[PDB]
Amino acid sequence: AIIRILQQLLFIHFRIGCRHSRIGVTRQ
C-alpha cells in the first residue's frame, strides 16, 4: 500500500497546503 503509506506523510503537506485558502471546497 505504498500509495497510502507515503500518503500518510503527503497527507500532511497536502493538508497544510490546502489550508492557505481552504481549497477544500473543490476549487483546485
UniProtKB/Swiss-Prot annotation:
Gene Ontology terms describing biological process: DNA-templated transcription; monoatomic ion transmembrane transport; protein homooligomerization; regulation of DNA-templated transcription; symbiont entry into host cell; symbiont-mediated activation of host apoptosis; symbiont-mediated arrest of host cell cycle during G2/M transition; viral penetration into host nucleus
One GO CC annotation: host cell nucleus
Subcellular localization: Virion; Host nucleus; Host extracellular space
Predominant localisation class: virion
PTM comment: Phosphorylated on several residues by host. These phosphorylations regulate VPR activity for the nuclear import of the HIV-1 pre-integration complex.
TM annotation in the entry: none
Modified residues (Phosphoserine): 21
Keywords: Activator, AIDS, Apoptosis, Cell cycle, Host G2/M cell cycle arrest by virus, Host nucleus, Host-virus interaction, Ion channel, Ion transport, Modulation of host cell cycle by virus, Phosphoprotein, Transcription, Transcription regulation, Transport, Viral penetration into host nucleus, Virion, Virus entry into host cell
Anything else known: HIV-1 lineages are divided in three main groups, M (for Major), O (for Outlier), and N (for New, or Non-M, Non-O). The vast majority of strains found worldwide belong to the group M. Group O seems to be endemic to and largely confined to Cameroon and neighboring countries in West Central Africa, where these viruses represent a small minority of HIV-1 strains. The group N is represented by a limited number of isolates from Cameroonian persons. The group M is further subdivided in 9 clades or subtypes (A to D, F to H, J and K).
UniProt function note: During virus replication, may deplete host UNG protein, and incude G2-M cell cycle arrest. Acts by targeting specific host proteins for degradation by the 26S proteasome, through association with the cellular CUL4A-DDB1 E3 ligase complex by direct interaction with host VPRPB/DCAF-1. Cell cycle arrest reportedly occurs within hours of infection and is not blocked by antiviral agents, suggesting that it is initiated by the VPR carried into the virion. Additionally, VPR induces apoptosis in a cell cycle dependent manner suggesting that these two effects are mechanistically linked. During virus entry, plays a role in the transport of the viral pre-integration (PIC) complex to the host nucleus. This function is crucial for viral infection of non-dividing macrophages. May act directly at the nuclear pore complex, by binding nucleoporins phenylalanine-glycine (FG)-repeat regions.
Subunit structure: Homooligomer, may form homodimer. Interacts with p6-gag region of the Pr55 Gag precursor protein through a (Leu-X-X)4 motif near the C-terminus of the P6gag protein. Interacts with host UNG. May interact with host RAD23A/HHR23A. Interacts with host VPRBP/DCAF1, leading to hijack the CUL4A-RBX1-DDB1-DCAF1/VPRBP complex, mediating ubiquitination of host proteins such as TERT and ZGPAT and arrest of the cell cycle in G2 phase.
Family: Belongs to the HIV-1 VPR protein family.
Protein name, per record: Protein Vpr
Lineage: Viruses, Riboviria, Pararnavirae, Artverviricota, Revtraviricetes
